[PDB]
Amino acid sequence: HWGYGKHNGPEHWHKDFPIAKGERQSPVDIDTHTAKYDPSLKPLSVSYDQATSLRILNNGHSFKVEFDDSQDKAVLKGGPLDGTYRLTQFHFHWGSLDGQGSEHTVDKKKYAAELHLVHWNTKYGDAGKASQQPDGLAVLGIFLKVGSAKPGLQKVVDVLDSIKTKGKSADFTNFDPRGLLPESLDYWTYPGSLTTPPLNECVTWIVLKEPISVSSEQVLKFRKLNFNGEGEPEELMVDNWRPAQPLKNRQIKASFK
């Protein structure tokens, strides 16, 4: 199985998923000085008022909150996107210590963690079929820095003890993902990929400029999770991030400055 260790981590993924060495892999370093301000980009429209979270689970590579995406309830549009994308899940990537954890970097800076709110293009009817298309998914990426607590994250942090090992899950209703957003929706965008196997090149990335702050106690709880299933050797779930990949011919566009 793929993972993040020395023997099954990012440098090994290309042997099962050759698109790892593709032309539009993610994440990337965002060079804020070469990114092109595009005055034609729209404001992002984040419409999460009717979101319905359902469950939270530890899948062995992160923890994920899944939403009811069977109706048009929590949708992303505007910005660089054509059409309408529906929120299906969010998850995080984070480090073994505060100076690393994010997948995207900004001028080579790593953040403590990165939140991925994952949406699929409604013209493809559902998430799996969307992941097979070059404009199938839109992932809103938000950086986490350690400082003051994010009140809206606490409901997530407080349930993680119940999903410590791979395969555990719990009901998780009435979680409002609006409480995980920073004030500004200024963003960078570029065409890329899933950052884990199968690494499909199906993602329009929209990475917010403004990080959210979370507390040390909040991120500490992420680090208590385990990659392993209950009954296997204990390997804390930390450093579940893919390093920056070559930008190749791509431009990163900015909605601002």
Ligand X SMILES: CCCSc1c(F)c(F)c(S(N)(=O)=O)c(F)c1F
Binding-site residue set for substrate: 195-196
Select 21 or 161, whichever has its Cβ closest to ligand X: 21
**Tokens 């984070």 correspond to what residue?**
94
Per CB under 6 A, 189 contacts ligand X: no
Binding-site residues from annotation for Zn(2+): 91, 93, 116
Distance CA 127, CA 115 (A): 18
Per CB under 6 A, 196 contacts ligand LML: yes
| In the complex, minimum distance from the CB of residue 37 to ligand X, in angstroms, rounded to a whole number | 25
Binder of residue 13, out of ligand LML, Zn ion, ligand X, none (CB less than 5 to 8 A by kind): ligand X
Per CB under 5 A, 61 contacts Zn ion: no
Given the residues 14, 61, 104, 119, the one annotated as active site: 61
Select 59 or 154, whichever has its Cβ closest to ligand LML: 59
Binder of residue 118, out of ligand X, Zn ion, ligand LML, none (CB less than 5 to 8 A by kind): ligand X
Contacts of 166 (CB under 8 A, 6+ apart): 58, 59, 60, 226, 227, 228, 229
CB 65 within 8 A of CB 55: yes
Per CB under 5 A, 116 contacts Zn ion: yes
Per CB under 6 A, 195 contacts ligand LML: no
Per CB under 6 A, 33 contacts ligand X: no
Select 166 or 221, whichever has its Cβ closest to ligand LML: 166
Select 145 or 242, whichever has its Cβ closest to Zn ion: 242
Q: Is 2 left (phi over 0), alpha (psi -120 to 50) or beta?
A: beta
Distance CA 155, CA 192 (A): 31
**Tokens 């909150």 correspond to what residue?**
65
H-state helical runs in the chain: 127-130, 154-157, 216-222
DSSP line for 127-168? HHHHTTSTT-EEEEEEEEEESS--GGGHHHHTTGGGG-STT-
Residues that bind Zn ion (CB under 5 A): 116
By annotation, the residues acting in catalysis are 61
